[PDB]
RNA sequence: CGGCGAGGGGAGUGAAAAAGAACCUGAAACCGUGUACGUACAAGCAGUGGGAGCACGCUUAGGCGUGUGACUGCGUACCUU
RNA sequence: GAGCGUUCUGUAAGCCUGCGAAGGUGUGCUGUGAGGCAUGCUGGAGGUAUCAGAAGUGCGAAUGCUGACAUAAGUAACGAU
């Protein structure tokens, strides 16, 4: 079925009220390399909890 | 309008407002509804009304003193400079000069001054007589005008 | 007596009807033809 | 001193890019770069490129320091839309608006 | 053109 | 000059205490509704609450004339199908009498946010005690 | 003090030194106007109520301004009956300055 | 002579929309809905000039009634007393006094009671 | 800056880039960003009559003007037929 | 019955105008109305008094025509399990 009346910009905003993203609360610093990373994720260089887990 | 007489879409079932020709005056690039044609804009004036209008115009010109009567009005040679000097001598700028006989030298002299016109006796008209600021009558022109107006 | 000091006589130049140009003119919408019928149809009417 | 970087006719829709822009509006530039690094959106990639360009503008052209910069303004406007055809069932054609957007980032210290 | 449920006869002639 | 109107941050509201023992329900309720609306003040303004706070003691001892103690039926609907409920006056007194007084005054008050504010001003007690001795109510004879 | 009088079919309660807007009086721009029909004069618990006019009490005003009031639009509209009409209106007024109340 | 209608059309539509400034949504944006609102606003304004006169008389009656009942007489008997004592102070001024000068209204109530008695 | 991009910011020409090639002017619908006010116990052609408070300008320090509009009386769109 | 406005012709090789025209967007004044007048900002070269004259002369509706842009909606779907 299909609408009888055109919804407004007000109701469009009210429906999109819950569409907002949530940023990550805080990043992490590694105790060896010192690089910010997602928690429980290995860093960009390949460190995790102070151990080089992957080469390069 | 250039186009065909085909119905643009079938009468019923399309869901669109019905149309019967692409050349409809409603449509974009359609024809004009009441398109104008070459027509004759001229009006008839009775001869006695035309003569009464000229008599009233001449009487009003004499009443407001815009009509100067001179005995003779001519130039020696067709020189616009000479005519302009003679009119500045007479202290006239915007002038219709009627002359009893069509003079080639005067006509060629006044052809280039756009505020000065030179007319023969038989060719005066209400728009020119009303529009031009001063009108200069020669005596022969006065006689011819009074004769043709009776 | 100039070209912009001449005016016609009083009552000699009454302006024509302009049919269908809004409510206030008194000739809007139907334009003096009533409602429906052969006499309000375009080109309608009977012969003499 | 406000410094402006724009990316025009960005091949993305204004609504999604508005989600990301409203995510970073008002933060410091370092926090904003962390947020745009770890947001999983194509609009986040586009907005991060514009923001890094704005920071480099504020360095090179006006001498502003990174540690003082904040994202004063950010807004996404609707750009022109390319119109395409998607053929449907039973001979019907439907039109597809491949939307674009203009992403503007204004960074400053005050 | 036209919808098949408008061309159909059992549902168009629903209230004769 | 423009007609004076009461201002909601300037008006003074008093506190009264009214014994409902032996009064007639309707006439007591009309006088309460008038004093909650504030029709008794020269500074009355229709869009401004200007009434007085009224405490009603012994709400379980009101009187109704005729057979109204047994025949006056209160109806309501629970919003579910078949959910029409009724309760007579004596059942309403036996269960909760403050609601008898409160429906009478609520039906006599205007409808809307302002009438809701005036009904907020009305305080009804079933016994002959109140907690509002700190506000120092004056005895009102109705 | 204040005094209740009538002018232009309406009644006004005025004090000394006030500016009062009345209906258009046929008095020139800067003259004085003498109101004799005073309904009531109050003088701080000294009240005089006329039956119908207070005897010997008059109000003296100085005409300050003449003018036209703020415009209003009159709209008349009969729907589906093809009837619509509009009009404008500005009401003339006279500002006086009440400068004397004498009992 | 062909006439193009852009300038006049824009002027008329903008006149209506400037009148319809302040309304909700399409009533202040869209010309059609705005025109339907401005006409209704004019009709309501006319009808409410009349209703303003009625409403203000109603308010004055209520205030005179409250003050007279405070002074120990009903509104109807108070007005009967004034019309019998031939006092021509109208209801606007009487409500004004009833709010601002209670002593003068006490004097008026005493006059009306003396006229009835 | 960017992918030896797209796009942009400086510099420069020009009277003007509030004429940069998607280029004279640049309306409305439509979509945003900032500021002021209102709005999370409140029912309906969404206005109108009354109306407090708040914010900003004030030039008789007097109230006025502008924006909002809590509360409130009345109030079921336009065309056609 | 009486009028407002718009385009064009005459008055007009006149009058206003790069010390800023038309157009666009605000503000203030004014008329009983259609409307007029003044001015800030954008604009960047035309406009036109007054009295007459001619009409492709005034739009909200026609399941009206053409372009642009919303809505359902960041929803269904993304074409062989
Ligand atoms: N509905 C079926 C059959 C169908 C096709 N065309 C029709 C026209 C009228 C009625 C039914 C049909 C289909 O789409 O294939
Ligand atoms: Mg319907
Ligand atoms: Mg054509
Ligand atoms: Mg002939
Ligand atoms: Mg008629
Ligand atoms: Mg019929
Ligand atoms: Mg019809
Ligand atoms: Mg007929
Ligand atoms: Mg035909
Ligand atoms: Mg096919
Ligand atoms: Mg009611
Ligand atoms: Mg043209
Ligand atoms: Mg707007
Ligand atoms: Mg480049
Ligand atoms: Mg140019
Ligand atoms: Mg442009
Ligand atoms: Mg715009
Ligand atoms: Mg409740
Ligand atoms: Mg609330
Ligand atoms: Mg609701
Ligand atoms: Mg109602
Ligand atoms: Mg032009
Ligand atoms: Mg011209
Ligand atoms: Mg036309
Ligand atoms: Mg239109
Ligand atoms: Mg219509
Ligand atoms: Mg859905
Ligand atoms: Mg779903
Ligand atoms: Mg899916
Ligand atoms: Mg596939």
In short:
By secondary structure, chain B is α/β, with parallel strands linked by helices.
Secondary structure blueprint with pairings:
This is part of a larger assembly, with 8 protein chains of 8 kinds.
Chain A: H1 9-15, E1 47-48, E2 51-52
Antiparallel strand pairs in A: 1-2
Chain D: E1 3-10, H1 14-24, H2 29-37, H3 42-60, E2 70-78, E3 82-87, E4 93-98, E5 101-108
Antiparallel strand pairs in D: 1-5, 2-5, 3-4
Chain H: H1 6-19, H2 26-29, H3 31-70, H4 75-84, H5 91-100, H6 102-116
Helix pairs in contact in H: 1-3, 3-5, 4-6
The structure holds tryptophan (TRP) and magnesium ion (29 copies).
The structure holds 2 RNA strands.
Structure write-up:
- The structure is cut from a larger assembly and holds 8 protein chains of 8 kinds.
- Chain A contains 1 helix and 2 strands; from the N terminus they run αββ.
- Chain A is mostly loops.
- Chain A has one domain.
- In chain A, strands 1-2 form a two-stranded antiparallel sheet.
- In chain A, β1 and β2 form a beta hairpin.
- The radius of gyration of chain A is 22 Å and the shape is rod-shaped.
- Chain C is mostly loops.
- Chain C contains no helices and no strands.
- The N and C termini of chain C lie far apart (about 50 Å).
- Chain D is of the alpha+beta class.
- In chain D, the strands form 2 sheets. Chain D has a 3-stranded antiparallel sheet, with helices on one face. In chain D, strands 3-4 form a two-stranded antiparallel sheet.
- In chain F, about 30% of the residues lie in helices and about 20% in strands.
- Chains G and H meet through β1, β5 and β8 of G and α3, α5 and α6 of H.
- The site of tryptophan (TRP) has 3 residues of chain E, from α1.
- The structure holds 2 RNA strands.
- Chain B: Belongs to the universal ribosomal protein uL4 family.
- Chain B: One of its GO terms (molecular function) is translation repressor activity.
- Chain B: Keywords: Antibiotic resistance, Repressor, Ribonucleoprotein, Ribosomal protein, RNA-binding, rRNA-binding, Transcription, Transcription regulation, Transcription termination, Translation regulation.
